Structure 1
Amino acid sequence: EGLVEYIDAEEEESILIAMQPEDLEPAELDVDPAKRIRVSHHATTFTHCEIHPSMILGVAASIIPFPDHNQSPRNTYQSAMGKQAMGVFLTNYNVRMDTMANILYYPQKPLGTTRAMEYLKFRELPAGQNAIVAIACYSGY
C-alpha cells in the first residue's frame, strides 16, 4: 500500500527519521518533573518515522525491564546471563532425547514485562521465578 519502507544501512544516510509520530504535531509549561527531558526537535523536513525505538534491542535485551534506566554494561552483562537462565526451553522436552536439559519446576511469567516480550513468548514460556527479594543487611552471609 506504500505506508512502510525497507531502509538499508546506506539508504538511511539520505533520510531524516523521527522518534515519535507525535513529532509532526503543531506547537504553540505545565509538565511532570519526573519525566525524562526530551530535546525539542527543532526539525521539520522528515522523511520516515521510527516504528518504535524499543526495536533497536535484540531478543536478549528485550527481556530487560527498564534498560533505559540502567547502566549500559549492565545490560551487556545481563544479555549473556539471560541465555544462561534455566527454564522451559521446549514444550516437547519429554519427547526429545538431548544431552542436557534442565527445566524449572514452576516457571512464572514475570510481573514486569517488556511490551516487546509478547512477540518472543516469554510470558508463554518463561525461565525464572517471581522471587520475593529483600535487599537487606542480615547475618553478613
Structure 2
Amino acid sequence: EGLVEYIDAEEEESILIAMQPEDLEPAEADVDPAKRIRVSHHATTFTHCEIHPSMILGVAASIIPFPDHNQSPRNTYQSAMGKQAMGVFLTNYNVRMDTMANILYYPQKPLGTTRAMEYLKFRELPAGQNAIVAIACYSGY
C-alpha cells in the first residue's frame, strides 16, 4: 500500500527521519520535571519516521529492563550474561537427546518487561525468577 518502506544505510544518507510520530510533528504556542529532557524537533522536513526507537537493539538488549538508565558497557555485559543463563530452552527437551541441557524447575516471567519481549517470547519461555532481593550489608558474607 506504500505506508511503510525498507531503507538501507546508503538510502538512509538522503532521508530525514523522526524518532517519535506525534512528539515529532505538532505545532507551537508547565512540563513534567521528572521526565527526560528532549530536544525540540527544530528541523521539519521529514521523509520518514522511526517505527519505534527501541528497535535499534536486538534479542539481547530487548531483554534488559530500562537499558536507557544504564552505563553503556553494563548493557553490553548483560548481553553476554543472558546467553550463559538457564531455563526452558524449548518445550520438547523431554523428547530431545542433547549433550548438556539445563532446565529451570519453576521458571517465572519477569515482573518488569520490554514491549519487545512479546515478539521474543520470553514471558512464554523464561530464564530467571522474581526473587525478593534486599540491598543491605548483613553478615559481610
Report the alpha carbon displacement of residue 41 of structure 1 after superposing the two structures with TM. 1.5
Q: 1:73 to 1:60 in 2, by over 3 A?
A: same
Q: Secondary structure at the match of 2:81?
A: helix
Report the alpha carbon displacement of residue 27 of structure 1 after superposing the two structures with TM. 2.2
Report the alpha carbon displacement of residue 25 of structure 1 after superposing the two structures with TM. 3.3
The RMSD of aligned alpha carbons is 1.2
Aligned twin of 1:110 = 110
Unaligned 5+ residue runs, structure 2?
A: none
Report the alpha carbon displacement of residue 23 of structure 1 after superposing the two structures with TM. 4.0
Report the alpha carbon displacement of residue 9 of structure 1 after superposing the two structures with TM. 1.0
Q: More displaced, 58-67 or 27-36? A: 27-36
Per-residue CA distance 1:21-70 (angstroms, 9 max, x = gap): 01453323911101000000201110000000000011010000000011
- Normalized against structure 2, the TM-score is what? 0.97
Q: Secondary structure at the match of 1:75?
A: helix
Unaligned 5+ residue runs, structure 1?
A: none
Identity of aligned residues (%): 99
Question: Displaced runs of 4+ in structure 1, greater than 4 A?
Answer: none
Q: 1:86 to 1:4 in 2, by over 3 A?
A: same
Aligned residues: 141
Contact 2:18 2:24 in 1 (8 A): no
